[PDB]
Design a protein around this ligand. Structure first.
Ligand SMILES: CCCCCCCCCCCCCCCCCC(=O)OC[C@H](CO[C@@H]1O[C@H](CO[C@H]2O[C@H](CO)[C@H](O)[C@H](O)[C@H]2O)[C@H](O)[C@H](O)[C@H]1O)OC(=O)CCCCCCCCCCCCCCCCC
Ligand SMILES: CCCCCCCCCCCCCCCCCC(=O)OC[C@H](CO[C@@H]1O[C@H](CO[C@H]2O[C@H](CO)[C@H](O)[C@H](O)[C@H]2O)[C@H](O)[C@H](O)[C@H]1O)OC(=O)CCCCCCCCCCCCCCCCC
Ligand code: CLA
Ligand code: CLA
Ligand code: CLA
Ligand code: CLA
Ligand code: CLA
Ligand SMILES: CC1=C(/C=C/C(C)=C/C=C/C(C)=C/C=C/C=C(C)/C=C/C=C(C)/C=C/C2=C(C)CCCC2(C)C)C(C)(C)CCC1
Ligand SMILES: CC1=C(/C=C/C(C)=C/C=C/C(C)=C/C=C/C=C(C)/C=C/C=C(C)/C=C/C2=C(C)CCCC2(C)C)C(C)(C)CCC1
Ligand SMILES: CC1=C(/C=C/C(C)=C/C=C/C(C)=C/C=C/C=C(C)/C=C/C=C(C)/C=C/C2=C(C)CCCC2(C)C)C(C)(C)CCC1
Ligand SMILES: CCCCCCCCCCCCO[C@@H]1O[C@H](CO)[C@@H](O[C@H]2O[C@H](CO)[C@@H](O)[C@H](O)[C@H]2O)[C@H](O)[C@H]1O
Ligand SMILES: CCCCCCCS[C@@H]1O[C@H](CO)[C@@H](O)[C@H](O)[C@H]1O
Ligand SMILES: [Ca+2]
Ligand SMILES: [Cl-]
Ligand SMILES: [Cl-]
Ligand SMILES: [Fe+2]
Lengths: 451, 137, 38, 342, 334, 81
């Protein structure tokens, strides 16, 4: 029982995985078995989603989060996002499920059967946390892998069917991306946009050419930096700035994951391009704009001049100006005038919503799309009663956007706490006082009093 | 109080013929109404146009009358405005427009009768709550 | 307004640089026990 | 003199797994009956005849919506004894009339007295000072003021809180709509006492855990402590310097620190109890007269104070008919206050 | 000893009466800016059109407010989530009308308070302490982020952020109940357990330690003079305290390890307030409390009201009256 | 220790489980039957799903007198046909 109790290892059972820090062979097993769990869930959850899936209902009425991801990549769907073939959903699930057994097999072998340490067995697979050259080499391998992964999305977009394009002329369709954006002013200009309203940082990417071209840049960058980190060792300024330990490296990754989880939370809440509303339901801004559109249409059909209808506040009842003059929907949805969506842009002129188009060019499919999104607003209870908090039972609905955003804010938050926990502990362990103050060497007793 | 055959007896047509639903039809009507209609009609109101509700008195004064099974089944095939002057299948779910309202694709004739029956029975149970909105919640 | 904008931009940049260079300046060694951290 | 009294004393004070004591004669039956009444009521008993509400698992309620509800308003402040003139010894009628509510409230009150006598009794046998009992006066002041004095000032037990999760939530919202209780400075002091109590709890525990002396070799620091050791397990000097430089001031006296921890939450609860005593009589902090005079005369004057009264007015009009069924409120749709569209 | 190293050694010096540190370099200017604007705005700012409907709310003392009703009023709903620094306004008068001050205060405060948390980590490193006091502060800090930043993001407007004032806070709470049924959300319920429990354990630990103080003084003097700052020996008898409390409940419901007792005092309120913070942060994306409206139905189909339905009646009253001039369409979707 | 037998001793002893493999399910089944026979309804006076209202009424049988409350409930119970 090497390091498998508190006396030998120093770690109680409730911190028992800390006993693995210098047991690279068992640590390998833990990581591989855990990836098996991830791949298992992906595989099994897809199959569950497929078994429970009725193609005639919108995905967002059915509690689906994985099938919408597959459909966005262009598999299984045709024009308007209608499901034409559920077989790709089946394949994706089965293959992930079968692979989890391979990973689970490796994980269990390395965890309990193989060598506990790898350094005696292989100097290639062996590592010391303090070896800055080896750690950046392992880092470089995984950057190259990530870069290949980013290029697989490009290959799917350009050579293997394309991607679902909610903005495609004619209501949305799978489209092959032939000219991805490569101009680095466009790709990197997203990185320098303000994150506030009307700008939205990278969350605002709104066309597939930019999505694909950005993954080309990311793939190259990851492959280059991966080669760079195989061939180099950390520079002196870098050496002096960081803590070089297992727990320190864990803490940096925890910080990075937390940040990504927060970005993903906003992506799914605001973006309707890589999270198409056909599959995920309308965004919050989208459903609110759709209500204004619905009652503009209803009242205009009854004979109202919506352009000149003064509401109770003095602002237009249907239409008003944004603080920079653009013609926008009125009422409380004035806050959402930054929303852009395919069902609304045909009414947009240079100055915003165009009154002549509103009067003459509103098509029945737009009235349909606004009424559907207004009645599938991402509001609902924890027991999945759809609607405002005061609504009665009847509609079993919580938007996927709500499920995906709340879960990932919660995870990102705890991963920020985990970063603080492990970064603070890594610093203290490195300096040698993570177990308490030395009584005979208490630093504050050697310092001058404050007053 | 109990869900009795009296409760489940509703007008079949405008001429005064009634039909008596089974409890199974009523409960099937409720489930199918939830599946296909409640996103806009929960509680008997109409979220996208609150001026029109599913109260029986409101359905009686529609053109043609909709306060009976045949009028309601016909509405789900070929919906009209309240005065009958216009056909609104392009914006209201119906069998005629099952291509653009895909949830209507797997509704059979028997399903339309059960949905219709639910709409006609619920006010007899709920009174003012049906089509009353939040004031009666 | 434009003068206010440049002043704030310069002020903020100033303090951010102090923060970044400050933590780049051998901070792990600024502890009361082990200095030799590199 | 070693008579029966002293022999009895001997047995009650035996060191056993559950100490009993003289206080235990009051404490144990009363606590047990209060708890068993609450479980019996929430599992099996309705509120149909007193409130028009279902309130038990038997009826389909869940852990959040079950309650032992208060008696009907027409019972006034009746003790509602099982053998009294309302139920007349009929156990089933008693349950339907709300007899379980006074049963729980009254056995609970005497249970609480018995718990506090237990704190005194054990403290005297062990030889410690009775500050735990003194601190327990604050939960007793809360229970007595909210569950007894408040309804005794009102028309009947009906307006006391009902014993349930969602029923207590209704009590919170009633207190906003009718009493504007968030505005009351006695509630404010109670909020300060409770949030400052939670703060002190967090900050003291964290400070100790992060100024520990290294008294062992393990990475789990819990083992390096011995209950009979003479030394402090953490550094008061380092803790004092940390907080003086982080926050400006710090504790330096460990006895003061722990008295303060007693003092803050206990005082807060006592202050909130005083305000509820006022609400027994509707002696509210509802309004600022100066604001009302200005706002009556100046229809452009708006504050968050006037915005909240509009919310209270919504609460009263929209919840009163269902929440007070004995009053027979019929409010036609046209009289209900509502904003535009909603 | 060059000038940069001199400056770094002063910044990180453990001899300053108040520790500065690198986090303090960001903390001090942002907290000063937020404090100065808050004080000035609270006293003298003119009314603010919070909901974008040309209906300005008076928040300052000079415009008819007292300490209880006063607030710094959130920025205009017309602005939504747009960034509104002073230099984006045509004039200060424009900036004040639209609630400019609110944005300046909360962005500087959130920056400064995050750096306050880093500063707590930083000083613990300089003094040779264990590092996790800042993890306890992350609980109130996350709550501030929830009501000032996260909730506005999910709802699309800083005009639904928490006001900077006492009655403004109550307004925020009441509308929150109407729109998310927060009382019925388990994360708020865990938060209440966190702070009720934290207050209970605060009084608990205070009373038990005070009950077992070792006699070191006479009756005419404060018992606090029986403890001396820096003394080596414990000032109370934990064995007597554990002997009392173990008999109050039973022996195994009582702590006799001061370290795990104090860890429990740390963990219980911090975890509870994390959940409260996460309640607000997830109701920000409209995943609301439990809805049992009309959950109980009789054999005929009559609605049988529960206490949940009575809560709903109260919520409807708040819903229909809040922001009475701000809605033109029947659903309040944000 | 206070002299009683340790709990861990007791609940790992075959004799404990011989006794309680009977007494626990026996009590569970007793609770089940208390509901399934409908006896719970009648002990506590709780309405069944079909006895909240009369077939056409929609008014609550709310108690409105203090000293005739018992008779009021009995009258409400008659009127259920
Ligand atoms: C190392 C750390 C260093 C720190 C650096 C500090 C520098 C500033 C920090 C950022 C401050 C962000 C504040 C504003 C956040 C926001 O409004 O976020 C929103 C933006 C997205 O913006 C939205 O983006 C939208 C893009 O959609 C547009 O484009 C779409 C295309 O499909 C659609 O068409 C859509 O309809 C259309 O409107 C619009 O522009 C909206 O108007 C716009 O508001 O998110 C985004 O930019 C990305 C998400 C940013 C992160 C969110 C912050 C969360 C922080 C939690 C901290 C908790 C800590 C707890 C302490 C314990
Ligand atoms: C501290 C730690 C303590 C630890 C806890 C101890 C727990 C002990 C439990 C004791 C419980 C006491 C129950 C009191 C019940 C009660 O009061 O019952 C109330 C009755 C009075 O009955 C009420 O009387 C009212 C007024 O009626 C009168 O007026 C009517 C209308 O005009 C008619 O004329 C009517 O005939 C006439 O009687 C209404 O009729 C009510 O419906 C009816 O309930 O008084 C009475 O029994 C007796 C009244 C006199 C003694 C009151 C002292 C005790 C209570 C002090 C609280 C002060 C509260 C004031 C607000 C603050
Ligand atoms: C993803 C979760 C995860 C993973 C991958 C690991 C992995 C590991 N843990 Mg950790 N641990 C975890 C969660 C996890 N743990 C949790 C939640 C706790 C708190 C309870 C701990 C507390 C803990 C302690 C206290 C210790 C470990 C230890 C270990 C290591 C050796 C375990 C051993 O020897 O078991 C032996 C047990 C068995 C052989 C029994 C069955 C185990 C197998 C693997 C079950 C697999 C079943 C599966 C269905 C088979 C699939 C086969 C198929 C693919 C063909 C191993 C790398 C030990 C260590 O660090 O050693 C140095 C150690 O002392 N863990
Ligand atoms: C990739 C992420 C990651 C990894 C690899 C580690 C790894 C480690 N952590 Mg860290 N940690 C993390 C993220 C991570 N952590 C996060 C996000 C937090 C914030 C909560 C923490 C907070 C934390 C603390 C406070 C501590 C550690 C510790 C450790 C060490 C021992 C861990 C252990 O054995 O736990 C064993 C696992 C358990 C005892 C089980 C926990 C059960 C959880 C709480 C249940 C969660 C509920 C679940 C999500 C849903 C409900 C399920 C239910 C219905 C069945 C180990 C090096 C310890 C350490 O410092 O050692 C050096 C330590 O004290 N971690
Ligand atoms: C990324 C995470 C994620 C998200 C966003 C979803 C989202 C969804 N799931 Mg999926 N699922 C997940 C992970 C996720 N799931 C996992 C890990 C499993 C395996 C257990 C499943 C297995 C699963 C099944 C079997 C089903 C779903 C279903 C659904 C839908 C309804 C959810 C619901 O009603 O929950 C109810 C809400 C809860 C149970 C709340 C959970 C509260 C947890 C315990 C709090 C944890 C807090 C934190 C993690 C712990 C911190 C502790 C602290 C000390 C540090 C919704 C689309 C349903 C569906 O509609 O399928 C079509 C369905 O039937 N999911
Ligand atoms: C990242 C995961 C990972 C890593 C770093 C290792 C590393 C190691 N394994 Mg382990 N193992 C793993 C996962 C991993 N394994 C998995 C998934 C399984 C189940 C198949 C195993 C089952 C296993 C057994 C049974 C044994 C090892 C052994 C070893 C050691 C020698 C391996 C060698 O020399 O191969 C040389 C390299 C090759 C043969 C090239 C293999 C190329 C693969 C098979 C094709 C796919 C490549 C491509 C990148 C895969 C993409 C996968 C991705 C989609 C997830 C080495 C320490 C040996 C050992 O421990 O000795 C005592 C040993 O006997 N492994
Ligand atoms: C997982 C990805 C990853 C990781 C963990 C590392 C890790 C490392 N890199 Mg490598 N690198 C990578 C990918 C990665 N790299 C890629 C893809 C490339 C190709 C572009 C490189 C090219 C590269 C070079 C040329 C160098 C490194 C170096 C290093 C080392 C110093 C890191 C450092 O000081 O950052 C700290 C970050 C900074 C100092 C940036 C400036 C500080 C700004 C102001 C912070 C801004 C934060 C703000 C919130 C940004 C938000 C988003 C923004 C874009 C708007 C460290 C071991 C250094 C080294 O030692 O090489 C041997 C070095 O010289 N890397
Ligand atoms: C180390 C360790 C651990 C962990 C472990 C783990 C984590 C493992 C994993 C594992 C895994 C991860 C496993 C897996 C497996 C899998 C499998 C075994 C699969 C199978 C499949 C199948 C058989 C399929 C089938 C099918 C088909 C094909 C079609 C469709 C339908 C169906 C589904 C039927 C613990 C914590 C315990 C502790 C101790 C140590
Ligand atoms: C894909 C895609 C795209 C693109 C993207 C990109 C291109 C990205 C990039 C990105 C990046 C490029 C990022 C970066 C990041 C960075 C970071 C995150 C950093 C950090 C840093 C740190 C953290 C540091 C720290 C420190 C200090 C400050 C002092 C000294 C010490 C230390 C070092 C600690 C787009 C949008 C177009 C479209 C969609 C898709
Ligand atoms: C009232 C009254 C009385 C009494 C009675 C009694 C005393 C009863 C008792 C009763 C009881 C004594 C009952 C109990 C019950 C219990 C239960 C019902 C429980 C349940 C539980 C559960 C369900 C659990 C859950 C959980 C939690 C809470 C957390 C942890 C985890 C779990 C999930 C497990 C007499 C005859 C004198 C007279 C007349 C009146
Ligand atoms: C927008 C942000 C840009 C970030 C740029 C990142 C580029 C990285 C290059 C950093 C430059 C290296 O230069 C860095 O600064 C000065 C050089 O005088 C040194 O500064 C420090 O040195 C030592 C560290 O041991 C300290 O004790 C000393 O107080 C201080 O002078 C750093 O140790 C060195 O690492
Ligand atoms: C009430 C209890 C009052 C005590 S009473 C007391 O009890 C003694 C037993 O020790 C007897 O010996 C004695 O005669 C009797 O008066
Ligand atoms: Ca290398
Ligand atoms: Cl309001
Ligand atoms: Cl509106
Ligand atoms: Fe203490």
């Amino acid at each position: 029982a090497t390091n498998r109790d508190q006396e030998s290892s120093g770690f109680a059972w409730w911190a028992g995985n800390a006993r693995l820090i210098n047991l690279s062979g068992k640590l390998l097993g833990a990581h591989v078995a855990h990836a098996g769990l991830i791949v298992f869930w992906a595989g099994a959850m897809t199959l569950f989603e497929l078994a429970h899936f009725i193609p005639e209902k919108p995905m967002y009425e059915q509690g689906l989060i994985l099938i919408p991801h597959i459909a966005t990549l262009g598999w299984g769907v045709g024009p308007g996002g209608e499901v034409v073939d559920t077989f790709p959903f089946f394949v994706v699930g089965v293959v992930h499920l079968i692979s989890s057994a391979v990973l689970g097999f490796g994980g269990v072998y390395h965890a309990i059967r193989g060598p506990e340490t790898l350094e005696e067995y292989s100097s290639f697979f062996g590592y010391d946390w303090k070896d800055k050259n080896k750690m950046t080499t392992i880092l470089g391998f995984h950057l190259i892998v990530l870069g290949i992964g980013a290029l697989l999305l490009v290959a799917k977009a350009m050579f293997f069917g394309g991607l679902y394009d909610t903005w495609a002329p004619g209501g949305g369709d799978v489209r092959v991306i032939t000219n991805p954006t490569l101009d680095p002013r466009v790709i990197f200009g997203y990185l320098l946009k303000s994150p506030f309203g009307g700008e939205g940082w990278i969350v605002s990417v709104n066309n597939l050419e930019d999505v694909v071209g950005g993954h080309i840049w990311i793939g190259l960058i990851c492959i280059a930096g991966g080669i760079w980190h195989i061939l180099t060792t950390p520079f002196g300024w870098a050496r002096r700035a960081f803590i070089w330990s297992g727990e320190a490296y864990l803490s940096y990754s925890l910080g990075a994951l937390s940040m990504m989880g927060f970005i993903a939370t906003c992506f799914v809440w605001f973006n309707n391009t890589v999270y198409p509303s056909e599959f995920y339901g309308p965004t919050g801004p989208e459903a609110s704009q759709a209500q204004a559109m619905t009652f503009l249409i209803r009242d205009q059909k009854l004979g109202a001049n919506v352009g000149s209808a003064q509401g109770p506040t003095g602002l237009g009842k249907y239409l008003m100006r944004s603080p920079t003059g653009e013609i926008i929907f009125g009422g409380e949805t004035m806050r959402f005038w930054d929303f852009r969506g395919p069902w609304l842009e045909p009414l947009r002129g240079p100055n915003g919503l165009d009154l002549n188009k509103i009067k003459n060019d509103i098509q029945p499919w737009q009235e349909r799309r606004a009424a559907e999104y207004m009645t599938h607003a991402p509001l609902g209870s924890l027991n999945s009663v759809g609607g405002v908090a005061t609504e009665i039972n009847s509609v079993n609905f919580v938007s996927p956007r709500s499920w995906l955003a709340t879960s990932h804010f919660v995870l990102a938050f705890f991963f920020l706490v985990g970063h603080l926990w492990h970064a603070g502990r890594a610093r203290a362990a490195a300096a040698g006082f993570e177990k308490g103050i030395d009584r005979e060497s208490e630093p504050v007793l050697s310092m001058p009093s404050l007053d | 109080a109990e869900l009795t055959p009296e409760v489940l007896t509703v007008p079949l047509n405008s001429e005064g013929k009634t039909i008596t639903l089974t409890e199974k039809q009523y409960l099937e009507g409720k489930r199918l109404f939830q599946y296909a209609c409640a996103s806009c009609h929960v509680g008997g109101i109409t979220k996208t146009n609150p001026s029109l509700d599913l109260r029986t008195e409101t359905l009686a004064l529609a053109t043609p009358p909709r306060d009976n099974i045949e009028g309601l089944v016909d509405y789900m095939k070929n919906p009209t405005t309240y005065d009958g002057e216009q056909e609104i299948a392009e914006v209201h779910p119906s069998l005629r427009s099952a291509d653009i309202f895909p949830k209507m694709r797997n509704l059979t004739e028997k399903d339309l009768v059960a949905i219709a029956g639910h709409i006609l029975v619920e006010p007899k149970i709920l009174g003012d709550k049906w089509g009353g909105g939040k004031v009666y919640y | 307004m434009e003068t206010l904008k440049i002043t704030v931009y310069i002020v903020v940049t100033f303090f951010v640089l102090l923060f970044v260079f400050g933590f780049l300046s051998g901070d792990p060694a600024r502890n009361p026990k082990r200095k030799d951290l590199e | 003199e070693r008579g029966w009294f002293d022999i009895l004393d001997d047995w009650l004070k035996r060191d056993r797994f559950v100490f009993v004591g003289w206080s235990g004669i009051l404490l144990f039956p009363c606590a047990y009956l209060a708890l068993g009444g609450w479980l019996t009521g929430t599992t099996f008993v309705t509120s149909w005849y007193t409130h028009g509400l279902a309130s038990s698992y038997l009826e389909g309620c869940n852990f959040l919506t079950v309650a032992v509800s208060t008696p009907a308003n027409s019972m006034g402040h009746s003790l509602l004894l099982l053998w009294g003139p309302e139920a007349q010894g009929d156990f089933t009628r008693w349950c339907q009339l709300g007899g379980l509510w006074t049963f729980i409230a009254l056995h609970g009150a005497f249970g609480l007295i018995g718990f506090m006598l237990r704190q005194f009794e054990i403290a005297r046998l062990v030889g410690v000072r009775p500050y735990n009992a003194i601190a327990f006066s604050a939960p007793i002041a809360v229970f007595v003021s909210v569950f007894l004095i408040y309804p005794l000032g009102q028309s009947s037990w009906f307006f006391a809180p009902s014993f349930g999760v969602a029923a207590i939530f209704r009590f919170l919202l009633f207190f906003q709509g009718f009493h504007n209780w968030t505005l009351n400075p006695f509630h404010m002091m109670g909020v300060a006492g409770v949030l400052g109590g939670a703060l002190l709890c967090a900050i003291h525990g964290a400070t100790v855990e992060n100024t520990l002396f290294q008294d062992g070799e393990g990475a789990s620091t819990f083992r390096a402590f011995n209950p009979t050791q003479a030394e402090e397990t953490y550094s008061m000097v380092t803790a004092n310097r940390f907080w003086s430089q982080i926050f400006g001031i710090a504790f330096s006296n460990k006895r003061w620190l722990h008295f303060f921890m007693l003092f803050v939450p206990v005082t807060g609860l006592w202050m909130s109890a005083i305000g509820v005593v006022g609400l027994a009589l509707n002696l509210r902090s509802y309004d600022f007269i100066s604001q009302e005079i200005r706002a009556a005369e100046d229809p452009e004057f708006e504050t968050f104070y006037t915005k909240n009264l509009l919310l209270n007015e919504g609460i009263r009009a929209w919840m009163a008919p269902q929440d007070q069924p004995h009053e027979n409120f019929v409010f036609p749709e046209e009289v209900l206050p509502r904003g535009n569209a909603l | 000893a060059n000038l940069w190293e001199r400056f770094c050694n002063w910044v990180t010096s453990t001899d300053n009466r108040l520790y500065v540190g690198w986090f303090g370099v960001i903390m001090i200017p942002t907290l000063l800016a937020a404090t100065i604007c808050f004080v000035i705005a609270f006293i003298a700012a003119p009314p603010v059109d919070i909901d974008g409907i040309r209906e300005p709310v008076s928040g300052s003392l000079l415009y008819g407010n007292n300490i209880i009703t006063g607030a710094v009023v959130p920025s205009s709903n017309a602005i939504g989530l747009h960034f509104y620094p002073i230099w984006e306004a045509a004039s200060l008068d424009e900036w004040l009308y639209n609630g400019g001050p609110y944005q300046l205060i909360i962005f500087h405060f959130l920056l400064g308070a995050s750096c306050y948390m880093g500063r707590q980590w930083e000083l613990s490193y300089r003094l040779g302490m264990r590092p996790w006091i800042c993890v306890a502060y992350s609980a109130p800090l996350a709550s501030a982020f929830a009501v000032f930043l996260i909730y506005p993001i999910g709802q699309g407007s800083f005009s639904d952020g928490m006001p900077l004032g006492i009655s403004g806070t109550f307004n925020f709470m009441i509308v929150f109940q109407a729109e998310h049924n927060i009382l019925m959300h388990p994360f708020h319920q865990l938060g209440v357990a966190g702070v009720f429990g934290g207050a209970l354990f605060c009084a608990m630990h205070g009373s038990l330690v005070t009950s077992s103080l070792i006699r070191e003084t006479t009756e005419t003097e404060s018992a606090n003079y029986g403890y001396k700052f820096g003394q080596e020996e414990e000032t109370y008898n934990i064995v007597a305290a554990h002997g009392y409390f173990g008999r109050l409940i039973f022996q195994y419901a009582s702590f006799n390890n001061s370290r795990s007792l104090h860890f429990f005092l740390a963990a219980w309120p911090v975890v509870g307030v994390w959940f409260a913070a996460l309640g607000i942060s997830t109701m920000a994306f409209n995943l609301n409390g439990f809805n049992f409206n009309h959950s109980v139905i009789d054999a005929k189909g009559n609605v049988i009201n529960t206490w949940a339905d009575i809560i709903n009646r109260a919520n409807l009253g708040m819903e229909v009256m809040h922001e009475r001039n701000a809605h033109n369409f029947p659903l309040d979707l944000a | 220790t206070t002299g009683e037998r340790p709990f861990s001793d007791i609940i790992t002893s075959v004799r404990y489980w011989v006794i309680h493999s009977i007494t626990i399910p026996a009590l569970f089944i007793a609770g089940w039957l208390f509901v399934s026979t409908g006896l719970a309804y009648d002990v506590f006076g709780t309405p069944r799903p079909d006895s909240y209202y009369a077939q056409e009424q929609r008014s609550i049988p709310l108690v409105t007198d203090r000293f005739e409350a018992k008779q009021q409930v009995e009258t409400f119970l008659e009127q259920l046909k």
